């Protein structure tokens, strides 16, 4: 919290902050400017003050301009050209001063204006001196400050500097420097592990090879030069084997550089340099095995390293040193097996640069070797053992380095030679003095219930309890929640403390306590009061603190509606008659009439079928059956009622009813056995002939017939031969008497080929006439050889009509006509759809007791597996959106005291697929679903037929029940409305229904954003609620925006899915899912937030977040980490517009549609394929994804293996995100390789 406290102090009093890099300079500059922006902005000349950023030179005057223009709405004037501003005059100076709020100008032009006298220091409020250290010398800044000293009222000077604390005599010089700076700037000064000197003993080679190396190296100096320097350094460090490895790499690369050399003279000098370098290459006689050592010739530095490793970040100077060190580390790990903790790695055109990034990603290796450039710019993980072969030549290096050793029991060791230790001691003592002076300049145990209650508390652990409560609150990696307090020193000596808890906790009040004499007592008593209030308001506790999966499958009973049970017409009870009306409303297009045969209209037939239903059945909608003639609109309509029948009449009815499904359609599977009185359903189907009437005479005509079962006998003789009575075959169904015995195949009479006769030509070459064909193949002694023959056509074998896809005397005539035959072949689909529609009507009225249409409920009950014309996907999407919306709104309006973490947990458990499965099962939904494909011979069960399982049971997965519940919710939302959907959710059992001035100068500056988005808030507190962050501790009126984010995201997901659903283009499920994932992505939200200037009004104190937002905003202006916070504020502002508009959605969609419009238009013109689906479709067999791999840091890793092409890995906060990243990486590689 050092940076935050520096900002607090800067806000309290004049401060000379001492940043270590310019990034922090610009950060504290813009941040304080925004804090005082309320004092800056104005509309009246005397009531308006301006900030001036005096810059040293003319080059640094654009970086601050950019920073303030980007991260703030303030307009920034720049006056950098010295001569051109010297040519200016009194008139325009005031003009420009009024034309800008933030002025950035050179010290020369600064003193120039001052002497002229146009802008007074009284009107300036923030005077930020860049590089203010120059005020010790005769820089203009001294005159400007002296003039300020001559002014009674002076701005809040914030000297900014980075050239302090870098001197050699700092123990005194730095003291006098700060003293002088404070005496001139008239301001204060504020700025923002143990040392183990390690002694290294001497070591020398017995043979003296080392001195020989110096000798030959020195001789070369007498007489390219770059490699000479490199060699000496590496050789000095250690044993000759690694040195020779480095020398080998040098010679290898030099043999190439010589060839690449451009100067022949240098080429010659470099060849002589090879002649010099090969001395090491030849000296191999002076040393022994490099793979069979015994630590006899190693360098003592490595000996010390090895001893330290055995007992248990290494900053290096030259690359070769790091390389050899890493090499010998693994070598010793192999040589000695007791170094179990040994695990090394090393660090230091564009191609090589890319590798460094991957090497950094392997930072989990405990021992990370690196060069001296690792001291700044990297957020190296926590290390417990820092080994430094060298010593810090510079104070800032010592400080920055020793900082990294952040371990509860840390060891910051520093290797030094025995003689050098004196110098190291002196230097570190000087540095210690420097750091000391710098830091100096900156500087009744409760019990719930004595009998049991909770463990015995102690006074010294209360603050610990409050600190772990602050740690248990939620936060992101860019924020840090810690308690605040200020000892209220009193002249009496008894001072109290006031705990300001984090901005996310419910206790937004000052938890003051009584005053005590000592700090410890005060702190522990205030922590005690805090624990009390927290356990009282409902935070602390007495302790002082698979279903729904696709794999699960079961077989449920089918649901024959409760309107067809025991409805068998009885003689002593009234009965209802219902005609099955049929009309052909869509004849086949002739272009598609590949059969080239005319159509038979069913409506033009006096004879039809009806249902004699005893118990009345609720009306259902007319539906279409696709027949050979096209589409027939079926409709069950009432004709008569209140008529009884005789016992023998009902017997006739039953025998004919079984005849229809046992001899005509051949739906008598051996598994079944007729049982009207015994079945679940027992209604009867009877013909109806316009006289409508049952036409009992027709039934008796078809019953007395001697052809009922099996072809009868014919009448072909010599005295009374057969005759061609064309009237008897004008509308007939024929049964060949010469083939298919015992299993006849029936045909129609398409026409009569009067032009063709038994003696006429025969199509097959084997015979010349039909008479010959019979006489030869079947040996049929036809008693007549002259007659007109009959054209034929087959009788449709197919019975799933739900969706689109001959010699007279030798064949008998079926008693029933062909029109009734086709009308009967249409029957099974009719009965199946009747069953389904009635089940839907029941599931409609049971929940309604107005309501949704039974056909749309049927669409909600049909899974995709059925391959029917209807499917579940679209309703699923919409319903899931609604569900999330509803749950979130309810949890946010009913539990105002819980934080986003608990709300998220509860919501994710209520909307989980297991809960929806349980809810659906409670309502019996799995018994009402059409999963199977219609196949009447296999899965159907005709009326009045029992099985004496595929018929009665069905297999459904729990996820399908969840899908069904969501789809019914979608149906109710798309038909009845939102209130109906809400009450249906509560019907399944999901209870989804039942400072003034601080605000003024905190909201000030949003009067332009309100205009940009064309919305003015009623209660301005919602703006602050949205544009806040968990680190904006200066905001005490409202809490953090995370709870608003929670509701906002759900609102924008429902709005976008609703818009995509009600689009005339009627996108398919895949397109809908893809667009949903594309528009509901955080990255897109951040892109839009940055585009519409949301970043200008955000408010957070985290510096890292500031830098990330800077990168992302610049990137979006030109057109890589996307800051989640920007998309989060986008969602939060959506939630705020929803909460401030009296709980309305239209307001949100009229404030956000003008922004998201272009994106949806583009993505609907070119749907972006999902990267995961695209990779699975591009490489379904070779691309395989590993299961979720949890990383040590808590993230999720995913590996994808493309067999024969490579392996790719991804990391993300979730499996889906990591999988998407892995798939994108593979696709980009595959597409680049292809």
Swiss-Prot record:
List ligand-binding residues for Mg(2+) 2. Answer: 1045, 1128, 1131
For this entry, the protein name equals Endoribonuclease Dicer
Region Required for interaction with PRKRA and TARBP2, annotated ranges:
199-443
Where ATP binds, per the record, is at 19-26
Question: What exactly does this protein do?
Answer: Double-stranded RNA (dsRNA) endoribonuclease playing a central role in short dsRNA-mediated post-transcriptional gene silencing. Cleaves naturally occurring long dsRNAs and short hairpin pre-microRNAs (miRNA) into fragments of twenty-one to twenty-three nucleotides with 3' overhang of two nucleotides, producing respectively short interfering RNAs (siRNA) and mature microRNAs. SiRNAs and miRNAs serve as guide to direct the RNA-induced silencing complex (RISC) to complementary RNAs to degrade them or prevent their translation.
Entry's localization field = Cytoplasm
Q: Species name for this entry?
A: Mus musculus (Mouse)
Q: Which residues form a coiled coil?
A: none
> Where is the PAZ domain positioned along the sequence?
697-815
The UniProt record gives the binding positions of Mg(2+) 1 as: 876
**Record GO terms (molecular function):** ATP binding; DNA binding; helicase activity; metal ion binding; miRNA binding; ribonuclease III activity
Q: Which residues form the DRBM domain?
A: 1167-1232
Reactions accelerated catalytically: Endonucleolytic cleavage to 5'-phosphomonoester
Q: How is the cofactor bound?
A: Binds 2 magnesium or manganese ions per subunit.
Main location class: cytoplasm
Q: Which cysteines are joined by disulfide bonds?
A: none
Keywords from UniProt, A to Z, are: ATP-binding, Cytoplasm, Endonuclease, Helicase, Hydrolase, Magnesium, Manganese, Metal-binding, Nuclease, Nucleotide-binding, Phosphoprotein, Repeat, RNA-binding, RNA-mediated gene silencing
The Phosphoserine modification is found at 1186
Pfam families hit by this protein: Dicer_dimer, Dicer_dsRBD, Dicer_PBD, Dicer_platform, Helicase_C, PAZ, ResIII, Ribonuclease_3
Is Cytoplasm a UniProt keyword of this protein? yes
Listed GO CC annotations: cytoplasm; cytosol; glutamatergic synapse; perinuclear region of cytoplasm; postsynaptic density, intracellular component; RISC complex; RISC-loading complex
């Amino acid at each position: 919290k050092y940076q935050v406290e520096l900002l607090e102090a800067a806000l309290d009093h004049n401060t000379i902050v001492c940043l270590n890099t310019g990034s922090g300079k610009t950060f504290i500059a813009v941040l304080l400017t925004k804090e005082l922006a309320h004092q800056i902005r104005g509309d009246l000349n005397p009531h308006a003050k301006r900030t001036v950023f005096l810059v040293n030179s003319a080059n640094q005057v654009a970086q601050q301009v950019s920073a303030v223009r980007t991260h703030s709405d303030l307009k920034v004037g720049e006056y950098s050209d010295l001569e051109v501003n010297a040519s200016w005059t009194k008139e325009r100076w005031s003009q420009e001063f009024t034309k800008h709020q933030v002025l950035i100008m050179t010290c020369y032009v600064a003193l120039t204006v001052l002497k002229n006298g146009y802008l007074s220091l009284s009107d300036i409020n923030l005077l930020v001196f860049d590089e203010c250290h120059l005020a010790i010398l005769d820089h203009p800044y001294r005159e400007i400050m002296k003039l300020c000293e001559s002014c009674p009222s002076c701005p809040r000077i914030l000297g900014l500097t980075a050239s302090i604390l870098n001197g050699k005599c700092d123990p005194e010089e730095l003291e006098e420097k700060i003293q002088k700076l404070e005496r001139i700037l008239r301001s204060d000064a504020e700025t923002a592990p143990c040392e183990i000197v390690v002694d290294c003993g001497p070591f020398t080679d017995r043979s003296g090879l080392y001195e020989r190396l110096l000798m030959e190296l020195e001789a070369a100096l007498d007489f390219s030069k770059q490699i000479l320097s490199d060699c000496r350094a590496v050789l000095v460090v250690l044993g000759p084997w690694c040195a020779d490895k480095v020398a080998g790499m040098m010679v290898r690369e030099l043999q190439k550089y010589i060839k690449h050399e451009q100067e022949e003279l240098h080429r010659k000098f470099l060849l002589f340099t090879d002649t010099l370098l090969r001395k090491i290459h030849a000296l191999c006689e002076e040393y022994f095995s490099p793979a069979s050592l015994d630590l006899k010739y190693v360098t003592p530095k490595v000996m010390k390293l090895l001893e330290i490793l055995r007992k248990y970040i290494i900053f290096v100077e030259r690359r070769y040193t790091a390389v050899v060190l890493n090499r010998l580390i693994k070598e010793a790990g192999k040589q000695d097996p007791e170094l179990a903790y040994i695990s090394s790695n090393f660090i230091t055109e564009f191609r090589k640069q890319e590798e460094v990034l991957r090497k950094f990603r392997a930072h989990e290796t405990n021992l990370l070797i690196a060069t001296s450039v690792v001291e700044e710019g990297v957020d190296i993980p926590k290390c417990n053992l820092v080994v430094r072969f060298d010593l810090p030549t510079e104070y800032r290096s010592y400080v920055q380095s020793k900082g990294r050793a952040r371990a509860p029991i840390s060891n910051y060791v520093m290797l030094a030679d025995t003689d050098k230790i004196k110098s190291f001691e002196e230097d570190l003592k000087t540095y210690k003095a420097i750091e000391k002076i710098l830091r100096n300049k900156c500087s009744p145990p409760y019990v719930l219930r004595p009998d049991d209650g909770g463990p015995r508390v102690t006074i010294n652990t209360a603050i610990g309890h409050i600190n772990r409560y602050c740690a248990r609150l939620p936060s992101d990696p860019f924020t840090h929640l810690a308690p605040k307090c200020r000892t209220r020193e009193l002249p009496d000596g008894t001072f109290y403390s006031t705990l300001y808890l984090p901005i996310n906790s419910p206790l937004r009040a000052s938890i003051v306590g009584p005053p005590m004499d000592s700090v410890r007592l005060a702190e522990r008593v205030v922590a005690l009061i805090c624990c009390e209030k927290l356990h009282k308001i409902g935070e602390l506790d007495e302790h002082l603190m698979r279903p729904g999966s696709t794999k699960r499958r079961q077989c449920y009973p089918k649901a024959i509606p409760e309107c067809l049970r025991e409805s068998y017409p009885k003689p002593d009870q009234p009965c209802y008659l219902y005609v099955i009306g049929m009309v052909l409303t869509t004849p086949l297009p002739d272009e598609l009439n590949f059969r080239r045969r005319k159509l038979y209209p069913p409506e033009d037939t006096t004879r039809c079928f009806g249902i004699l239903t005893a118990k009345p059945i609720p009306q259902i909608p007319h539906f279409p059956v696709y027949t050979r003639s096209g589409e027939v609109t079926i409709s069950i309509e009432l004709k008569k009622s209140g008529f009884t029948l005789s016992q023998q009449m009902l017997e006739l009815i039953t025998r004919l009813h079984q005849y229809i499904f046992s001899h005509i359609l051949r739906l008598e599977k051996p598994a079944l056995e007729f049982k009207p009185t015994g079945a679940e359903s027992a209604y009867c189907v009877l013909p109806l002939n316009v006289v409508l009437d049952i036409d009992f005479k027709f039934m008796e005509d078809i019953e007395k017939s001697e052809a009922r079962i099996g072809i009868p006998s014919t009448k072909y003789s010599k005295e009374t031969p057969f005759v061609f009575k064309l009237e008897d075959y004008q509308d007939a169904v024929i049964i060949p008497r010469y083939r298919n015995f015992d299993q006849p195949h029936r045909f129609y009479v398409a026409d009569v080929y009067t032009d063709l006769t038994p003696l006429s030509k025969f199509p097959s070459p084997e015979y010349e006439t039909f008479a010959e064909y019979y006489k030869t193949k079947y040996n049929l002694d036809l008693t007549n050889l002259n007659q007109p023959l009959l054209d034929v056509d087959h009788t449709s074998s197919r019975l799933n009509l739900l969706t689109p896809r001959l010699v007279p005397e030798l064949c008998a005539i079926h008693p029933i006509p062909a029109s009734l035959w086709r009308k009967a072949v249409c029957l099974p689909s009719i009965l199946y759809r009747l069953h389904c529609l009635l089940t839907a009507e029941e599931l409609r009225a049971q929940t309604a007791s107005l309501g949704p249409n039974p056909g749309l409920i049927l669409q909600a009950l049909t899974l995709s597996n059925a391959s029917d014309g209807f499917n579940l996907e679209r309703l699923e999407m919409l319903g899931d959106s609604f569900l999330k919306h509803a749950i979130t709104t309810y949890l946010f309006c009913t539990y105002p005291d819980a934080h986003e973490g608990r709300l998220s947990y509860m919501r994710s458990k209520k909307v989980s697929n297991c809960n929806l499965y349980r809810l659906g099962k409670k309502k019996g939904l799995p018994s009402r679903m059409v999963v199977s494909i219609f196949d009447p011979p296999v899965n159907w069960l005709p009326p009045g037929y029992v099985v004496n399982d595929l018929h009665t049971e069905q297999c459904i997965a729990d996820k399908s029940i969840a899908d069904c519940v969501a789809a019914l919710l979608g149906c109710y939302l798309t038909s009845c409305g939102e209130r109906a959907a809400q009450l249906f959710l509560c019907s399944l059992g999901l209870k989804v229904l039942p400072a003034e001035k601080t605000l003024n100068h905190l909201i000030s500056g949003f009067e332009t954003f309100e205009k940009k988005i064309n919305y003015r808030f009623k209660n301005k507190a919602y703006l602050l609620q949205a544009f806040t962050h968990a680190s904006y501790h200066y905001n005490t009126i409202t809490d953090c925006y995370q709870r608003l984010e929670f509701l906002g995201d759900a609102i924008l997901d429902y709005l976008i899915t609703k818009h995509l659903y009600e689009d005339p283009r009627q996108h398919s499920p895949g397109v809908l899912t893809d667009l949903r994932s594309a528009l509901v992505n955080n990255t897109i939200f951040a892109s839009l937030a940055v585009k519409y200037d949301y970043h200008k009004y955000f408010k957070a104190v985290s510096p890292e977040l500031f830098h990330v937002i800077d990168d992302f905003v610049k990137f979006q202006l030109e057109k890589i980490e996307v800051p989640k916070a920007m998309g989060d504020i986008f969602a939060s502002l959506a939630g705020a517009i929803y909460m401030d508009s009296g709980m309305s959605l239209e307001v949100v969609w009229q404030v956000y549609y003008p922004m998201m419009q272009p994106l949806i238009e583009k993505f609907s013109a070119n749907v972006p394929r999902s990267p995961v689906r695209e990779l699975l479709e591009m490489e379904p067999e070779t691309a395989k994804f590993s299961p979720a791999e949890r990383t040590y840091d808590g993230k999720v890793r995913v590996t994808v293996e493309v067999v024969g092409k490579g392996k790719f890995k991804g990391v993300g906060r979730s499996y889906r995100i990591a999988k998407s990243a892995a798939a994108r990486r593979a696709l980009r590689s595959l597409k680049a390789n292809q």
